Design an enzyme around this catalytic site. Structure first.
Site, PDB file in Angstrom:
ATOM      1  N   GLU A 101       1.574  -2.264 -11.985  1.00 45.93           N
ATOM      2  CA  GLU A 101       1.014  -1.593 -13.124  1.00 45.93           C
ATOM      3  C   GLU A 101       1.913  -0.177 -13.470  1.00 45.93           C
ATOM      4  OE1 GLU A 101      -3.218  -1.049 -12.505  1.00 45.93           O
ATOM      5  OE2 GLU A 101      -3.546  -2.795 -13.782  1.00 45.93           O
ATOM      6  N   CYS A 118     -11.107   2.223 -14.091  1.00 48.13           N
ATOM      7  CA  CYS A 118      -9.706   1.822 -14.551  1.00 48.13           C
ATOM      8  C   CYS A 118      -9.545   0.774 -15.359  1.00 48.13           C
ATOM      9  CB  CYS A 118      -9.095   1.637 -13.023  1.00 48.13           C
ATOM     10  SG  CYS A 118      -9.584   2.081 -11.532  1.00 48.13           S
TER      11      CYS A 118
HETATM   12 MG   LIG Z   1     -12.500  -1.778 -14.835  1.00 48.48          MG
HETATM   13 MN   LIG Z   2      -3.608  -5.071 -14.267  1.00 46.88          MN
END
Ligand SMILES: [Mg+2]
Ligand SMILES: [Mn+2]
Ligand SMILES: [Mg+2]
Ligand SMILES: [Mn+2]
Lengths: 176, 180
Positions: free
Chosen positions: B113, B64
């Site tokens: 997010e 991520c």
């Molecule tokens: Mg990362």
């Molecule tokens: Mn973030």
């Protein structure tokens, strides 16, 4: 605090300071593993603090530790339940008395132990020691076993070995 | 590094320093999530390094991150795979473009997010970056989905939310096929 070094057979031959004892070359010593259930039959699963030298931040069974010189296993269990979790328990019962193992954590820290496994019920509320436990969850033994069986890497290697032992899983299962 | 700020809508407003951005309040910002599969169709699950500001030592999906200024989300995905995993990948596929998530981590760091999710195949060996990833496993997706179902608390919450989106899950499934 110390760990008890054990020769080929499990005879105590001496001691090491607990912190100094756990390295990339950890020598065989004495320990215990415990699985705690509440009156409702839910299993406490805990997550080790990020400051633990060995397997920090790892999800695992309720409480684990190192008996001191002259301390019974049962007492060490009672002691660490009070110390890590501020919880009182019923007399611990044996569920995997011959468990032994060696494993290496992600940073290369080894545990190398003779580690009899116990179970008990809590008789008071938890009071968390955040130097030892960063998180926990009360759950269904059945779901935890399903998790261990599907993604054992999500849990400590000894939790997995104990939970997959035929007889120990039987004895834990009767704790609900 | 920094993050790209979005208003109450998913419209960029500006930028903010990365680390400094993620605190106990954190403003809405753009991010990505990606799920990586090897040729065999196994899923790469990874464990965040103990030094990560947020969710350190947590098991999660492959990678991520935060796209930076001027970068496309897919480029972001490609960069982080290289940075964290040292791995080359096929063009990332969009599998959950509208995933949004707000969540507080065990020590109170907030993630807030807009986080489109991708899937891709790895095309090189791994070179894990120990500053970012402390452990990893190649697994069967089916297995991971069973564990997520059984003990969801044992994984990052975004891994679980993405995995249980029906549409996302079918795309994950498509990547388990063996490819040569
Ligand atoms: Mg990362
Ligand atoms: Mn973030
Ligand atoms: Mg302990
Ligand atoms: Mn030990």
């Amino acid at each position: 605090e110390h760990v008890i070094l054990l020769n080929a057979q499990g005879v105590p031959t001496g001691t090491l300071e607990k912190y100094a004892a756990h390295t990339a070359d950890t020598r065989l010593h004495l320990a215990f593993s415990s699985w705690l259930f509440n009156a409702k039959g839910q299993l406490l699963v805990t997550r080790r603090a990020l400051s633990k030298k060995a397997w920090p931040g790892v999800w695992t069974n309720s409480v684990c530790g190192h008996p001191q010189l002259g301390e019974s296993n049962e007492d060490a269990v009672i002691r660490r339940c009070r110390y890590e979790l501020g919880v009182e328990i019923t007399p611990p019962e044996s569920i995997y008395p011959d468990f032994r193992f060696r494993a290496t954590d992600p940073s290369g820290i080894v545990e190398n132990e003779v580690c009899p496994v116990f179970a008990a019920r809590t008789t008071s509320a938890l009071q968390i020691n955040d130097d030892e436990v960063m998180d926990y969850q009360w759950c269904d033994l059945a779901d935890v076993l399903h998790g261990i069986d599907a993604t054992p890497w999500a849990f400590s290697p000894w939790m997995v070995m104990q939970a997959t032992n035929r007889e120990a899983r039987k004895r834990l299962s009767a704790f609900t």
